[PDB]
């Protein structure tokens, strides 16, 4: 199977994002089942507009996402988007069933939500982008990626 937890293992310097509230809220902290910094990533703004990105070096084959919200929060993700590329650049959205796919997200801070893709991706990079949060805080998020060397 192709399956390991790619996300879990990574140094702050394979995270990055789009903006973090503060350097406790930096990507790197965005690891499902850890509570390091502030719990988890969010954005200094929330829009449809803001991304979390990892960078696994070489090309990936991914099979399965995970996430959670930001640790005993009223912060985090009920819906995204994941794109990915090899480059870093001209980021592909992921599609399932016959369009751009929104993942069901998070209900609460600390319960992880993990979905098996219908079909598995190959990249080095991948984004999580949030196309919706909880009303009564902000994005948060932290993720696992499960996969394989291509």
């Given at each position: 199977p192709c399956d390991e937890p790619l996300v879990s293992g990574l140094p702050h310097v394979a995270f990055s994002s789009s903006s973090s509230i503060s350097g406790s809220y930096s990507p790197g902290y965005a690891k499902i089942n850890k509570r390091g910094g502030a719990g988890g990533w969010s954005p200094s703004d929330s829009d449809h507009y803001q991304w979390l990105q990892v960078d696994f070096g070489n090309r990936k084959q991914i099979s399965a996402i995970a996430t959670q919200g930001r640790?005993?929060?009223?912060?985090?993700?009920t819906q995204y988007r994941m794109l990915y590329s090899d480059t870093g650049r001209n980021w592909k959205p992921y599609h399932q069933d016959g369009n751009i796919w929104a993942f069901p997200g998070?209900?609460?801070?600390d319960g992880v939500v993990r979905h098996e893709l219908q079909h598995p991706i190959i990249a080095r990079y991948v984004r999580i982008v949030p196309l919706d949060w909880n009303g009564e805080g902000r994005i948060g998020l932290r993720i696992e990626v499960y996969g394989c060397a291509a």
């Open positions: 640790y005993s929060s009223s912060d985090w993700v998070n209900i609460n801070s």
